[PDB]
Design a protein around this nucleic acid. Structure first.
Lengths: 77, 102, 46, 62, 95
RNA sequence: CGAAGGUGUGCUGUGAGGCAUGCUGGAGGUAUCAGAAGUGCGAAUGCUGACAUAAGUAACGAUAAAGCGGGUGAAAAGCCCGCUCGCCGGAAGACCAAGGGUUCCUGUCCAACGUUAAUCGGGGCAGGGUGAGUCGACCCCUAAGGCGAGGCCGAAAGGCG
RNA sequence: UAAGGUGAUAUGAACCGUUAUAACCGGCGAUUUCCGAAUGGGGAAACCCAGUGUGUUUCGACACACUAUCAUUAACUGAAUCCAUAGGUUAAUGAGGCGAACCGGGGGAACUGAAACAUCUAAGUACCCCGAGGAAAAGAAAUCAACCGAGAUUCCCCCAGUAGCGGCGAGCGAACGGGGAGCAGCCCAGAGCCUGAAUCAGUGUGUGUGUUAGUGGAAGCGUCUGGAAAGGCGCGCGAUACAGGGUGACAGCCCCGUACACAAAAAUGCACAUGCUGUGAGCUCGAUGAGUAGGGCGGGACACGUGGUAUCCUGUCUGAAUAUGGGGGGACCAUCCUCCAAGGCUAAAUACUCCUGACUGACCGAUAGUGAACCAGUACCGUGAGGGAAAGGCGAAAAGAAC
């Protein structure tokens, strides 16, 4: 599925309200990307599927922390 | 806790036999009893060659409701009602009027 | 003339047979509804 | 029975069980030839069997 | 094989004109046996229990008929029939 | 010493109605004043059951076809036996697969079933009947196609492989 | 508990028992073929084919046990590639499926209404999907109020069809405040001191209490009518029992019962007691949840349809302050008041009935009442999903009509 492995962002739903306000079902997808990150302590490249948001958060926290929360939540990376 | 039993002498309260006395052959589950010389019916029997049973009208004894028969007190000569007490450690029957055991 | 039901056993059982139902979500819902209505036989089996 | 059987060892019980199956066999043999008068016998043995078996178990069980 | 199983195999002698015919003419007996028993076990069981020599056992399965009792439709149970060939030096016992 | 209900008859009220009572019935009914209503039927091409009508009328399923003697039997155009006649014969014959599931064979019965009778039956009831190393299925091997560990994908279910 | 029994349609045969190993009722046990999550492989469900390891046995084969996946932990193994990881095998622990309604989350209509119809409505309903428990959810203020104050949530009645929202149409619809039901508060983001010290969980034992079989349980005769009395007439008696049912018509006193008074070998529900092991009290000093708050853009939730629209949620792009601080007080600003977000647990009052027991009804009485008073989700109809009937009453007793 499209799910951010970091922030847990998922597809959500909403509408097109047109100019005449005709409401129509739609979705908002997370913005997702398959990316290789450098883990120094493991000396290795982990590949996560993450949103832009996720990436930014990886910059802030460091990747060690993030992966610690991936083993904690118990989801495989 | 069963009041009327095999071989008790009873007197009949109700029916064509009212007042007659007799001896219990057996009891049935439905609360019916079958009493000696009591409630004869005339039954027609199709002759059966396997059992060598002739035909004819057999007088037989038909079950009577156990509510209708009373346990006969031989002491008082009256119909009685029955009750239970514990003598020794054993459950025993007695007559209500003279409160004597059976 | 040629009518609509031309029977076959292998066909019958692959299409509606027990195992065929159990294969899927929907089928097990059928078997649920039947067990709830309390049928004599659920599926077509011999 | 069943007190009587309880005081016998496991071996003698196996032996009794086999006797019983011979007797049972023999019985339903007689019964299927129409040679049986006393039917009540089948039930007698058919149940005794169970008794024996139910002991064997608890002697192994504990 | 175990003997305990054996004594459970053979239900009953099958009685009929066909039966009598084979028993007289071809030296063969006819048995109702447990639905699950096999040619091995029947060979074993006759050879054991009647103590006579079996040549070969042929079998078939009889589908019970369908009956009506008081409008109700029942089904008579299935069962298994066995033609049991005795080696000729044998002569029948019925017990 | 005969309730409700059914059927009559008689009387009485402006009316829906009421009272009494002969038969039937064989154990429940209910004054009075109040209370609550699944409260009143002829229609709805109303819904269920029952019985009419046309009418003892149309019809009895291939225009291949029957006739006689004897048997059985309550009763024989139709059943069994014999004799002639006639129809199919690249089938209206014989053997399978499929599909059915005991309809097979014997005895026995004739209510219903059989478009008539039926003593007959694929009908009823009871019994018997299906014997495999080498015929099939199973089994060994794969086709299209299916399912599909991990895997890829997808809001969830799930899709693809 | 017992003098009768071997379930029913349903007789009989063959028996078992009568003072307690007949039967019957309950407690714990034993057995529990095959299918089915189905789990050794497969499969057209109730079948087909195995492997490994023990154990015999004359050595023909038989018996018995283990063998699913997936998650997690361990152990051993172990490529590309040196370490390493991936991977591979064994082992222990758990999960999978079913089920009525209620519950929280993920998706989510249209008919209809608007006397047409698009916003709106219907309605976050039907339905689908996931997850859970006997309840769940919610929950200890970055809450409201109004210069006086309240003090978590849930639920009921008001406030009020008001304030408002709305093609200002159709409609929708609060809150503040008040009366009640119920009431309970806690921990982590850390050190020191005194340490098993509150609580809570596990387990034994004791008594008490409920449940699962049970025991006793009052007092009536005569007479007419009649097939039969319980009915009429006469004289009695019981009542902490005149609930109700049955017996040849309508019985307090014939039978079962009913009020009342009792009982558990064993298993279980709740209580305190007490022992136990695991869980840590209290105090002092600290500390105080960042890609977060807010913002831009797009939607949604708030009664509130972007409106002057606060307030919450977030797909997207961003982005602070840290008690000399921040949030809210219906645009917004200042003043005044109040509150501390971005960490987590929590009983009760509330909703529901597949199911067990008892009691009741100005509920029905066989075309009614459940589709189903009867062997009914049956026959029968449909390839299938599914549809889906008809059918109660001899009598007191079969005495069911010998000849």
């Amino acid at each position: 599925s499209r799910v951010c492995q970091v922030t847990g962002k998922r597809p959500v739903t909403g509408n097109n309200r047109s100019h005449a306000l005709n409401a129509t079902k739609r979705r908002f997808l997370p913005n997702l990307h398959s990316h290789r990150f450098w883990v120094e302590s493991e000396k290795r490249f982990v590949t996560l599927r993450v949103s832009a948001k996720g990436m930014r958060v990886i910059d802030k926290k460091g990747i060690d922390t993030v992966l610690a929360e991936l083993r904690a939540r118990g989801e495989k990376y | 806790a069963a009041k009327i039993r095999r071989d008790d002498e009873v007197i009949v309260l109700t029916g064509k036999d009212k007042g007659k006395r007799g001896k219990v052959k057996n009891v049935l589950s439905s609360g019916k009893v079958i009493v000696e010389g009591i409630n004869l019916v005339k039954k027609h029997q199709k002759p059966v060659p396997a059992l060598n049973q002739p035909g004819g009208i057999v007088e037989k004894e038909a079950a009577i409701q156990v509510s209708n028969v009373a346990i006969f007190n031989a002491a008082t000569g009256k119909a009685d009602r029955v009750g239970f007490r514990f003598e020794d450690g054993k459950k025993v029957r007695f007559f209500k009027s003279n409160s004597e055991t059976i | 003339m040629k009518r609509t039901f031309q029977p076959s056993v292998l066909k019958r059982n692959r299409s509606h047979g027990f195992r065929a139902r159990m294969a899927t979500k929907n089928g097990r819902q059928v078997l649920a509804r039947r067990r709830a209505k309390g049928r004599a036989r659920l599926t077509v089996s011999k | 029975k069943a007190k009587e059987l309880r005081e016998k060892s496991v071996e003698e019980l196996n032996t009794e069980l086999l006797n019983l199956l011979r007797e049972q066999f023999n019985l339903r043999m007689q019964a299927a030839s129409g040679q049986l008068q006393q039917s009540h016998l089948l039930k007698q043995v058919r149940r005794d069997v169970a008794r024996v078996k139910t002991l064997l178990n608890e002697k192994a069980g504990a | 094989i175990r003997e305990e199983r054996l004594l459970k195999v053979l239900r009953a002698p099958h009685v009929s004109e066909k039966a009598s015919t084979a028993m007289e003419k071809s030296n063969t007996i006819v048995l109702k046996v447990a639905k699950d028993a096999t040619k091995a076990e029947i060979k074993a069981a006759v050879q054991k229990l009647f103590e006579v020599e079996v040549e070969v056992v042929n079998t078939l399965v009889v589908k019970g008929k369908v009956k009506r009792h008081g409008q109700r439709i029942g089904r008579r149970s299935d069962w298994k029939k066995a033609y049991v060939t005795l080696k000729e030096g044998q002569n029948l016992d019925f017990v």
